[PDB]
Coordinates of N, CA, C and O and ligand atoms in Angstrom, one line a residue:
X1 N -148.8 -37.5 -72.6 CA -148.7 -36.0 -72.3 C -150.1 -35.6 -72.0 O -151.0 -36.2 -72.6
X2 N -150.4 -34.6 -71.3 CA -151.2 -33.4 -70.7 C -151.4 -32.7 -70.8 O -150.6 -32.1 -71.4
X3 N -152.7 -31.6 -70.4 CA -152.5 -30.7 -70.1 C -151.6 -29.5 -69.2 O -151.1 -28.4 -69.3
X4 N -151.5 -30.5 -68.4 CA -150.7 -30.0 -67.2 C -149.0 -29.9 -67.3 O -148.3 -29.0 -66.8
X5 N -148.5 -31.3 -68.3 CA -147.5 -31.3 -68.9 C -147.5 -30.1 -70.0 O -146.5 -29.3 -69.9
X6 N -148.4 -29.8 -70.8 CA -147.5 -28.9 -71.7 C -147.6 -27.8 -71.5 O -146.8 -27.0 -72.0
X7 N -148.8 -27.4 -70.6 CA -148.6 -26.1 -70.0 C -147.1 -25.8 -69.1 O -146.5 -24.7 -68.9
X8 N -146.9 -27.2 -68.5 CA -145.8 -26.9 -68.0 C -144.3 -26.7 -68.3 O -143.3 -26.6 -67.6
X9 N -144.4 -26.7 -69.7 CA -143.2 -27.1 -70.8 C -143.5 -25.2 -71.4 O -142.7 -24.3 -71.4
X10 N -144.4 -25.1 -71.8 CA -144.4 -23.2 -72.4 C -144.4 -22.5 -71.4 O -144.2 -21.3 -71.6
X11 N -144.5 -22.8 -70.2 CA -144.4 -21.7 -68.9 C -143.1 -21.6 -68.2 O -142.6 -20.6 -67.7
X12 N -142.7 -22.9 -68.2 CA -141.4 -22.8 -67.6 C -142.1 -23.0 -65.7 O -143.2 -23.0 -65.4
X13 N -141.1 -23.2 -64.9 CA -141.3 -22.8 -63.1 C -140.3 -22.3 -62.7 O -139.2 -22.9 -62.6
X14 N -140.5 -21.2 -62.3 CA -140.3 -20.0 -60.7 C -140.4 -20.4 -60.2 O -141.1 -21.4 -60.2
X15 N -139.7 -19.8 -58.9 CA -140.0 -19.8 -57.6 C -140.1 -18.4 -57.2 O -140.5 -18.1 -56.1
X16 N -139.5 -17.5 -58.2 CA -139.4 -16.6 -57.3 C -139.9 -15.1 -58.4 O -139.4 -15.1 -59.6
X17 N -140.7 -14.1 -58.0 CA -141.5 -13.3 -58.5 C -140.6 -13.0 -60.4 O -139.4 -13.1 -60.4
X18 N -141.2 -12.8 -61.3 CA -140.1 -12.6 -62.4 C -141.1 -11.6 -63.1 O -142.3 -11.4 -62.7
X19 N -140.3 -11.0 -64.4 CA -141.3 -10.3 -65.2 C -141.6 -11.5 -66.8 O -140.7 -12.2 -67.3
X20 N -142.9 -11.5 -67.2 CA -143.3 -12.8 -68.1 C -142.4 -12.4 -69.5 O -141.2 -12.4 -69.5
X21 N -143.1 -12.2 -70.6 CA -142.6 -11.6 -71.8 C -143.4 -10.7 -72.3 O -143.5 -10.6 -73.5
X22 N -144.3 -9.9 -71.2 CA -145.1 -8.6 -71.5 C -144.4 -8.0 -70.7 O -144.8 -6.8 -70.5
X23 N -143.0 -8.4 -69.9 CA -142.9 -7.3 -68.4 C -143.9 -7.5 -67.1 O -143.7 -6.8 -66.1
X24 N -144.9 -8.5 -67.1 CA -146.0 -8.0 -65.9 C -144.9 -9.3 -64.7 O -144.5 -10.3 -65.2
X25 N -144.7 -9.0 -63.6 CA -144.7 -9.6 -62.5 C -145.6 -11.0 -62.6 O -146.8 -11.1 -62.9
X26 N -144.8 -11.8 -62.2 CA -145.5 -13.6 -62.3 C -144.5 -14.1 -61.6 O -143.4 -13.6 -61.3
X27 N -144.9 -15.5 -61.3 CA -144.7 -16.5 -60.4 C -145.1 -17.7 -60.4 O -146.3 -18.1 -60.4
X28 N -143.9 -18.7 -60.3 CA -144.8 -19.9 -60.6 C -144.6 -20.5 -62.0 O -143.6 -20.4 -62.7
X29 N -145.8 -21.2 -62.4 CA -145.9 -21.6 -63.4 C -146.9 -20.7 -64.2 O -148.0 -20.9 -64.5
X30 N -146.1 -19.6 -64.5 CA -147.3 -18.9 -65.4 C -148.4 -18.0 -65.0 O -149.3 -17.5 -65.8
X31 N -148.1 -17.8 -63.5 CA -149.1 -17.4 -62.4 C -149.0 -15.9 -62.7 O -147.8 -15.5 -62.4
X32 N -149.6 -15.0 -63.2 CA -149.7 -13.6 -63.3 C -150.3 -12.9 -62.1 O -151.4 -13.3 -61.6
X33 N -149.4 -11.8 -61.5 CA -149.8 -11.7 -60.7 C -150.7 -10.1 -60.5 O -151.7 -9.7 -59.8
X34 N -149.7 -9.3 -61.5 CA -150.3 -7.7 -61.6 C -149.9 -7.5 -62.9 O -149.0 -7.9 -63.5
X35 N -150.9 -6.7 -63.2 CA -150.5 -6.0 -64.7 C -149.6 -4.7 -64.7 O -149.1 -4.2 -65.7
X36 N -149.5 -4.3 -63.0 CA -148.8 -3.1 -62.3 C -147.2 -3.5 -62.2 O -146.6 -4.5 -62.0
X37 N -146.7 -1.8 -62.7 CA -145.4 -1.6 -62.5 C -144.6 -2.2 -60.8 O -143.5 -2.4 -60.5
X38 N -145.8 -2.2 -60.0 CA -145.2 -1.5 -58.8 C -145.0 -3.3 -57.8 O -145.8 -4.1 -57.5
X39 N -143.1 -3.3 -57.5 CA -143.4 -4.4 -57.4 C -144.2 -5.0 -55.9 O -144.7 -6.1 -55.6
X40 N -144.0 -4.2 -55.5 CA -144.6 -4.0 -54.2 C -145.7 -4.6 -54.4 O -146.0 -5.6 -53.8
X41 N -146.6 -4.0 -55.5 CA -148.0 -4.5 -55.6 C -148.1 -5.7 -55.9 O -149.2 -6.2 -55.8
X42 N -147.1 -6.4 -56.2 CA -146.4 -7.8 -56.6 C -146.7 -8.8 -55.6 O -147.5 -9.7 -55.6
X43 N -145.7 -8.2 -54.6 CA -145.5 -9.0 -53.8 C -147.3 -8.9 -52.4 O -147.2 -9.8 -51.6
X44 N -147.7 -8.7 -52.3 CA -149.1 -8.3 -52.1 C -149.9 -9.0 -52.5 O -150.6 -9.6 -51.8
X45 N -149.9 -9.2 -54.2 CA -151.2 -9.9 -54.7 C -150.5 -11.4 -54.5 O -151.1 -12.3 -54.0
X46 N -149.6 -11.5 -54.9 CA -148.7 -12.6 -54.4 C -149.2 -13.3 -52.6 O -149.8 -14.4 -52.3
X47 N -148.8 -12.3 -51.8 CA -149.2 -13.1 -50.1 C -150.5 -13.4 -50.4 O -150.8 -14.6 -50.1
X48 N -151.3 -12.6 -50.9 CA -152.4 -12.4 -50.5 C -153.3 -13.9 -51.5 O -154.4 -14.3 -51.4
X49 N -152.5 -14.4 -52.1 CA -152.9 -16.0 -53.1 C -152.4 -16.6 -52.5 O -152.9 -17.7 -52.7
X50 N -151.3 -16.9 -51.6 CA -151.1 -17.9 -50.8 C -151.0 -18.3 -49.3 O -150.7 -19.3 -48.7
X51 N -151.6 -16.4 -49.1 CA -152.2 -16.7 -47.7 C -151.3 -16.9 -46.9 O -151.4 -17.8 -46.0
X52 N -149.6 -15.9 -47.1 CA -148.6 -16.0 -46.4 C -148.2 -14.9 -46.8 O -148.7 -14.3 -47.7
X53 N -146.8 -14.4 -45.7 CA -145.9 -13.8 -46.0 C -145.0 -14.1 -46.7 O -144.1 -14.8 -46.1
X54 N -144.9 -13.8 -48.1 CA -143.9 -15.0 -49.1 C -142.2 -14.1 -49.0 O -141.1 -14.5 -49.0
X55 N -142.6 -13.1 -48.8 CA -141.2 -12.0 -49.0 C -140.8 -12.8 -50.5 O -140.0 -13.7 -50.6
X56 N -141.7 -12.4 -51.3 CA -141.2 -12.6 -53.1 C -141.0 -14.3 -53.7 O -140.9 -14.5 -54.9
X57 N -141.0 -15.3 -52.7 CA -140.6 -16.1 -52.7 C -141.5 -17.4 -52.1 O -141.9 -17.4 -50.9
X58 N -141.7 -18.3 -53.1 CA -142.9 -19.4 -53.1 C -142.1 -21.0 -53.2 O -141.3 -21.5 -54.0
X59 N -142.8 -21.7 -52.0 CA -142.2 -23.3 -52.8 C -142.9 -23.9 -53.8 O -143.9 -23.5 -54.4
X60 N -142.3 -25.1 -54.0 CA -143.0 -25.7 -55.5 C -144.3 -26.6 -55.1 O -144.7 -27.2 -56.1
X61 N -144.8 -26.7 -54.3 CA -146.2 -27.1 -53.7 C -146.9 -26.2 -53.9 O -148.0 -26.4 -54.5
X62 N -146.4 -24.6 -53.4 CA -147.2 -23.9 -53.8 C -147.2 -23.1 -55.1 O -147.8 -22.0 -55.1
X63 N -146.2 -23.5 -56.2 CA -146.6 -23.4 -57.3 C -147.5 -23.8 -58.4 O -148.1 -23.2 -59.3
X64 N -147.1 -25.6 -57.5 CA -148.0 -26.6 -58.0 C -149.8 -26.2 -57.9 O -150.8 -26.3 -58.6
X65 N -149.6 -25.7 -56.3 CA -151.4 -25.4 -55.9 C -151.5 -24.4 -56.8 O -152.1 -24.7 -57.8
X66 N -151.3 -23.5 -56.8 CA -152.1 -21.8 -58.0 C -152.0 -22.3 -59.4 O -152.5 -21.6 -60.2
X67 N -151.2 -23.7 -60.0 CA -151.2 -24.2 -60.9 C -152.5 -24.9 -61.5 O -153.2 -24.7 -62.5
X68 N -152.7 -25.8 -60.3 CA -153.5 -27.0 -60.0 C -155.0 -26.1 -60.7 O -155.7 -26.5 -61.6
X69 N -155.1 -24.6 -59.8 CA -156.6 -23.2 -59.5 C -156.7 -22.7 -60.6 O -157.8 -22.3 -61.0
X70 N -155.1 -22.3 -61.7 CA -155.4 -21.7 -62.6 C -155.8 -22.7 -63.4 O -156.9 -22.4 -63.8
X71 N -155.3 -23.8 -63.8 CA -156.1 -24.8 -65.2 C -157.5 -25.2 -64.9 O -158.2 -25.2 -65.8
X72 N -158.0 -25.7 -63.6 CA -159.1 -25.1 -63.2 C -160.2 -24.3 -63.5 O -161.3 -24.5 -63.9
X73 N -159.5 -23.3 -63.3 CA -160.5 -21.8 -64.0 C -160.7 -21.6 -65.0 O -161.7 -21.1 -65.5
X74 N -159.1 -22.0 -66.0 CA -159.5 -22.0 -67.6 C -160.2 -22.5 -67.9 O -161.2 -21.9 -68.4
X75 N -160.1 -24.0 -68.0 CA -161.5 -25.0 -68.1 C -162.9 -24.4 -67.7 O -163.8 -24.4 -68.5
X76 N -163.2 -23.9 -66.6 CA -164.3 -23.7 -66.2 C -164.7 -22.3 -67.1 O -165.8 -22.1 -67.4
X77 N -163.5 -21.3 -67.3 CA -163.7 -20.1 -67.9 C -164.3 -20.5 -69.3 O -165.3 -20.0 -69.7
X78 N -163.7 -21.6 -70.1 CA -164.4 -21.8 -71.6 C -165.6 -22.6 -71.5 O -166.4 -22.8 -72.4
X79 N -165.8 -22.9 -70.5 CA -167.2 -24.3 -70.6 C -168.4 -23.1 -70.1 O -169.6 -23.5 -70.2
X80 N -168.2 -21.8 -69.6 CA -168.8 -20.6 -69.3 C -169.1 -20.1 -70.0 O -170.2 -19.6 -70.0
X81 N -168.2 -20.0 -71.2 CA -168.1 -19.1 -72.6 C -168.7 -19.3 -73.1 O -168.7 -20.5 -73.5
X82 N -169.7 -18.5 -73.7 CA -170.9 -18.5 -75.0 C -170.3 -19.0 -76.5 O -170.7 -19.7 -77.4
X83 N -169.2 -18.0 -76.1 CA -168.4 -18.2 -77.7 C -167.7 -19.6 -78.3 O -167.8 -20.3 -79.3
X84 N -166.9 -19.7 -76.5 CA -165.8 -20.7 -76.7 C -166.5 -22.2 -76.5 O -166.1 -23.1 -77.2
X85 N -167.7 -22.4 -75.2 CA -167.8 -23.8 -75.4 C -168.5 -24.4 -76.4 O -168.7 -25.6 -76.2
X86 N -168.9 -24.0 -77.3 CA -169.1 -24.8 -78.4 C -168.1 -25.2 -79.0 O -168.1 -26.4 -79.3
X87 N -166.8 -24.4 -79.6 CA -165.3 -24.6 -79.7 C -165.1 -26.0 -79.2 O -165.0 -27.0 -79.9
X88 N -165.2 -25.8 -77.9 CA -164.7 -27.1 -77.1 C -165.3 -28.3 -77.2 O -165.1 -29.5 -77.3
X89 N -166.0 -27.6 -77.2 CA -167.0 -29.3 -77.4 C -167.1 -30.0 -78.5 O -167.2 -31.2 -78.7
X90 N -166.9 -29.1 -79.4 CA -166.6 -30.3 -81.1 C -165.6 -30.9 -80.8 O -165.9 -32.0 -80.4
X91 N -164.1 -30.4 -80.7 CA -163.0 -30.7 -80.7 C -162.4 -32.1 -79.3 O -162.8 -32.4 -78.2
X92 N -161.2 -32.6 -80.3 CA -161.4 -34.3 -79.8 C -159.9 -33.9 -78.8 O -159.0 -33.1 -79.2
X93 N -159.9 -34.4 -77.8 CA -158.8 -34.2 -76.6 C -158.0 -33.9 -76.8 O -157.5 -33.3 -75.8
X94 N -156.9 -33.7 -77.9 CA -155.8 -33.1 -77.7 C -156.0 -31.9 -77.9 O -155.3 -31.1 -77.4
X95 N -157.1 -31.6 -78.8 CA -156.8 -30.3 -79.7 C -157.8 -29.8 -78.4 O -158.2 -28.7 -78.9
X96 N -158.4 -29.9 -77.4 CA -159.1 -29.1 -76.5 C -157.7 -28.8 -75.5 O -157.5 -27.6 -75.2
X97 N -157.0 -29.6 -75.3 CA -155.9 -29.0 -74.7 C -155.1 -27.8 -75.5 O -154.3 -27.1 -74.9
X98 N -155.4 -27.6 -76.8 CA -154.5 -26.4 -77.2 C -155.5 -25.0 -77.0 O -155.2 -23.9 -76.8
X99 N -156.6 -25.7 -77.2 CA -157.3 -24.3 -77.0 C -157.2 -24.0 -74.8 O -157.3 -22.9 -74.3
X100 N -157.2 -24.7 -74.4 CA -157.0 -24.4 -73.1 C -155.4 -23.9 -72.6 O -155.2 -23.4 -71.5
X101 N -154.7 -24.3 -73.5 CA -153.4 -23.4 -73.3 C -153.4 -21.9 -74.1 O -152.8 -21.0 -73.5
X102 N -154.0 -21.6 -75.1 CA -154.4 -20.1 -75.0 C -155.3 -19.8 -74.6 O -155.6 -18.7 -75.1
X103 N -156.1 -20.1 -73.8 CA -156.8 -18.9 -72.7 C -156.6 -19.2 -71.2 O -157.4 -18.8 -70.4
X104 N -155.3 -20.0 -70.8 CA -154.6 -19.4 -69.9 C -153.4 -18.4 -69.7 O -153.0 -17.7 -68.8
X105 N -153.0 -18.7 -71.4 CA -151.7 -17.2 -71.5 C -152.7 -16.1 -71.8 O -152.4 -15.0 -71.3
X106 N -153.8 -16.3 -72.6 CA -154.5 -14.9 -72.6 C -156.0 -14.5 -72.3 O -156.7 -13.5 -72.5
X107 N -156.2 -15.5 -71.8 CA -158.0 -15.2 -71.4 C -158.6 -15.4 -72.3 O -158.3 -15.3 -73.5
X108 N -159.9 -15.8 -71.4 CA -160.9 -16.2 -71.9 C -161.6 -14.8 -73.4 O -162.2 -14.9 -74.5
X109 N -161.2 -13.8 -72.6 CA -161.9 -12.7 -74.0 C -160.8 -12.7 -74.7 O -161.2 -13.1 -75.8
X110 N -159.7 -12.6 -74.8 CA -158.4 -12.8 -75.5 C -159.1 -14.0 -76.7 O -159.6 -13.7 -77.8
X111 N -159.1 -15.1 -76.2 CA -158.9 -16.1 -76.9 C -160.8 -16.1 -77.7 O -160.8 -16.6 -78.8
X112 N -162.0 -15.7 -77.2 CA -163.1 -15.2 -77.6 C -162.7 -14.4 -79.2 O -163.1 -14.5 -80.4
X113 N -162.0 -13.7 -78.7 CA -161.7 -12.9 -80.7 C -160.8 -13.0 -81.3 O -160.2 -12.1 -81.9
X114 N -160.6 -14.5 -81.3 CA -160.1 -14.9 -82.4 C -161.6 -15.3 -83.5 O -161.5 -16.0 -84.6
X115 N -162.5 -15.0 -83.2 CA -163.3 -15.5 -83.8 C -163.7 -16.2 -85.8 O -164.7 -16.8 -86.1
X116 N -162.9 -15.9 -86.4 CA -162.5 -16.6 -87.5 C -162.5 -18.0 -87.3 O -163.2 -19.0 -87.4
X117 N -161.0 -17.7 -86.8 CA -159.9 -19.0 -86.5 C -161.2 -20.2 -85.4 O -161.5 -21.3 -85.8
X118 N -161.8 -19.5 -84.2 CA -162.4 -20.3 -83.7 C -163.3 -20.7 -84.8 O -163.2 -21.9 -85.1
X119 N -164.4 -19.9 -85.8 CA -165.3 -21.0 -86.8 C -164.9 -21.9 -87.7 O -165.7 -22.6 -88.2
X120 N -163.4 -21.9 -88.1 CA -162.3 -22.9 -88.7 C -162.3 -23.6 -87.8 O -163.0 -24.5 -88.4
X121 N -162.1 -24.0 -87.0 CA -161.8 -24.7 -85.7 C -163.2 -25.6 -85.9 O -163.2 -26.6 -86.5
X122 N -164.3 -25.2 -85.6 CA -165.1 -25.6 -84.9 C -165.9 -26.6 -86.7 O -166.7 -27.5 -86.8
X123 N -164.9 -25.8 -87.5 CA -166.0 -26.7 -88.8 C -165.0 -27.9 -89.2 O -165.2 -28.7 -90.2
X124 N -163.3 -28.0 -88.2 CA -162.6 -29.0 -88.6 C -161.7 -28.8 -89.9 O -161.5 -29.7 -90.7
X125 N -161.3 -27.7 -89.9 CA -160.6 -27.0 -91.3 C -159.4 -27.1 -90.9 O -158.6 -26.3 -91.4
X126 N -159.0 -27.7 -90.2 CA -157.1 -27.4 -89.7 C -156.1 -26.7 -90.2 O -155.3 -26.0 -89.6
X127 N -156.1 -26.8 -91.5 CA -154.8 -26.4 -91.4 C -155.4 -24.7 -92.4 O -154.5 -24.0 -92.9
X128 N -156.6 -24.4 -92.6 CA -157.1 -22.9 -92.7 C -156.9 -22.8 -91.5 O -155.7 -22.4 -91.5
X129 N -157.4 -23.0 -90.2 CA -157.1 -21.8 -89.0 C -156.0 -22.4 -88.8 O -156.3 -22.5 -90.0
X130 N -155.2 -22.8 -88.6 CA -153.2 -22.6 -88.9 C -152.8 -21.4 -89.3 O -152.1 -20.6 -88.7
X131 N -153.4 -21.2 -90.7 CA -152.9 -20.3 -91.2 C -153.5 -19.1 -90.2 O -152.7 -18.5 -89.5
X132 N -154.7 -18.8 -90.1 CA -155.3 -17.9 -89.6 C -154.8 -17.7 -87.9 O -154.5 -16.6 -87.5
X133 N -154.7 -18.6 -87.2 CA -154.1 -18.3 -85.9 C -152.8 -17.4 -86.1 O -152.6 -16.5 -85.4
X134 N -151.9 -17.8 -87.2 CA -150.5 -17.1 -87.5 C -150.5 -15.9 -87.4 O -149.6 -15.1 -86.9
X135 N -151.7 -15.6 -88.0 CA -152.1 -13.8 -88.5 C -152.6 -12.9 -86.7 O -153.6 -12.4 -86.4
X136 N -151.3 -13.1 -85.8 CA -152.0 -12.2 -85.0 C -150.4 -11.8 -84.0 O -149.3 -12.3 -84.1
X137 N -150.7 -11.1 -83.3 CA -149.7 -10.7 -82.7 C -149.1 -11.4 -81.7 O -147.9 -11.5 -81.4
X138 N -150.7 -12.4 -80.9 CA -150.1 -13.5 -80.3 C -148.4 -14.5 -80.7 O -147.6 -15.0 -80.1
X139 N -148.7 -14.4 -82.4 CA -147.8 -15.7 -83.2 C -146.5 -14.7 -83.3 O -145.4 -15.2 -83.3
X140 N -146.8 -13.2 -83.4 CA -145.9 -12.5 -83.6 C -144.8 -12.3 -82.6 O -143.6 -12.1 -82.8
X141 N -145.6 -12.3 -81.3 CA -144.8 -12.0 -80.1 C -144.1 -13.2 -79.7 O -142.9 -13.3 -79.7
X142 N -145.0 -14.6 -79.4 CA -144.4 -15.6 -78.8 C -144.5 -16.5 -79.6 O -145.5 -17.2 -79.4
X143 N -143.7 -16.8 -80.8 CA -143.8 -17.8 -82.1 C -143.4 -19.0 -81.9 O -143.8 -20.0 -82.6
X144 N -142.5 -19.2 -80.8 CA -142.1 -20.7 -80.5 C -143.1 -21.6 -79.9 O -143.3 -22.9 -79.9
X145 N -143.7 -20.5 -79.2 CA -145.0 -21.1 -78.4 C -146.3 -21.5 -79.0 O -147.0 -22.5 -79.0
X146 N -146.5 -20.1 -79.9 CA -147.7 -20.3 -80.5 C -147.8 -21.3 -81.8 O -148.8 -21.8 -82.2
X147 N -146.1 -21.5 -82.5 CA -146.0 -23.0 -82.8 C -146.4 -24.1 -82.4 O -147.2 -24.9 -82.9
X148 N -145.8 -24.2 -81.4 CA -146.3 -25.6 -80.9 C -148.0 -25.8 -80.6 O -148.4 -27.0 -80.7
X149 N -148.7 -24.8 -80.3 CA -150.0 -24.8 -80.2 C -150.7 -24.8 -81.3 O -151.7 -25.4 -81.3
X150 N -150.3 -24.2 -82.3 CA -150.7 -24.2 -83.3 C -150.7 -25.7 -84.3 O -151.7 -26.5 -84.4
X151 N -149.7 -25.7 -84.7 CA -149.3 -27.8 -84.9 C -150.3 -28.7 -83.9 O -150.9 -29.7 -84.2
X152 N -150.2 -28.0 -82.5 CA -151.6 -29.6 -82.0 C -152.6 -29.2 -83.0 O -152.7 -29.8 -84.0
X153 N -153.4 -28.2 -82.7 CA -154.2 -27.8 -83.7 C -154.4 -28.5 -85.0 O -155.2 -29.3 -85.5
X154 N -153.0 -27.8 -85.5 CA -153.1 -28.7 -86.9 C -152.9 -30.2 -87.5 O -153.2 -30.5 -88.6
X155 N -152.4 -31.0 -86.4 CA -152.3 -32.1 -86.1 C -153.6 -32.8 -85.5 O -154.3 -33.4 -86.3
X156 N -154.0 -32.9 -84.3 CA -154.1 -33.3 -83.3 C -153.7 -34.5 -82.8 O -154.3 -35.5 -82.5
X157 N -152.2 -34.0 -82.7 CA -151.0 -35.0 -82.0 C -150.3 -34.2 -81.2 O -150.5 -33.0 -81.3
X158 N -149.2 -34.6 -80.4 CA -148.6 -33.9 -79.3 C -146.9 -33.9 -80.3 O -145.8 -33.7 -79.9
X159 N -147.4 -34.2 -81.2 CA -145.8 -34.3 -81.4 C -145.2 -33.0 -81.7 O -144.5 -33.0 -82.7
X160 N -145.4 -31.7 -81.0 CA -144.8 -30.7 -81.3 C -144.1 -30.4 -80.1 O -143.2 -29.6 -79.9
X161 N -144.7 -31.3 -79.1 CA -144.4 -31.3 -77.8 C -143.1 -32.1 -77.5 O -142.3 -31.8 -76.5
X162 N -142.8 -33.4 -78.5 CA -142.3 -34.3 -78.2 C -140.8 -34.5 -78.6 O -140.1 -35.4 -78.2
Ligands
CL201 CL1 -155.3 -16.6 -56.9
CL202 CL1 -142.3 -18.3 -77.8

């Protein structure tokens, strides 16, 4: 298992423009596209990422490609991060893949204030920031997900995946 696999197991794949579990317009694997009501603006930031006329609608190559750009950028977004690449860098491969699956559902400042939980993390306390990851609205809103992220964490095994 992957990164790429288990992002692709909590995102699910589109093809075709949807609203996420905030409501925002997305595409793809997880591909956010506007934080805007308007779907029009949708389909717009949409052409305008794949550099076509999609009329709302994407193949899976090019789901695959904005997939390929967004894990990409997450990586690149935490190894940027003041806060987060030290995070990363203690932490032994699997459990870097959990932290790179929350700051592609929520960004890099998203995933920056957790700041507790990240100094749990980073001093190898597992199953304290378990607890502490729980305590947030992230765990509150999407609990299936933030399970399974949470368990690599507290593990560092994929078996939450498996
Ligand atoms: Cl893009
Ligand atoms: Cl969930």
């Amino acid at each position: 298992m992957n990164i790429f696999e288990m992002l692709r197991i909590d995102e699910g794949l589109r093809l075709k423009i949807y609203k996420d579990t905030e409501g925002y317009y997305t595409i793809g694997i997880g591909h956010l596209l506007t934080k805007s009501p308007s779907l029009n603006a949708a389909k717009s930031e949409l052409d305008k990422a794949i550099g076509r006329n999609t009329n709302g609608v994407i193949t899976k190559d090019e789901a695959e490609k904005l997939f390929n750009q967004d894990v990409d950028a997450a990586v690149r977004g935490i190894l940027r991060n003041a806060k987060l690449k030290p995070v990363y860098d203690s932490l032994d491969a699997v459990r870097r893949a959990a932290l790179i699956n929350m700051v592609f559902q929520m960004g890099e400042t998203g995933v920056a204030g957790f700041t507790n939980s990240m100094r749990m993390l980073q001093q190898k306390r597992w199953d304290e920031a378990a607890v502490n990851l729980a305590k947030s609205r992230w765990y509150n809103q999407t609990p299936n997900r933030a399970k399974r992220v949470i368990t690599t964490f507290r593990t560092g095994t994929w078996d939450a995946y498996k």
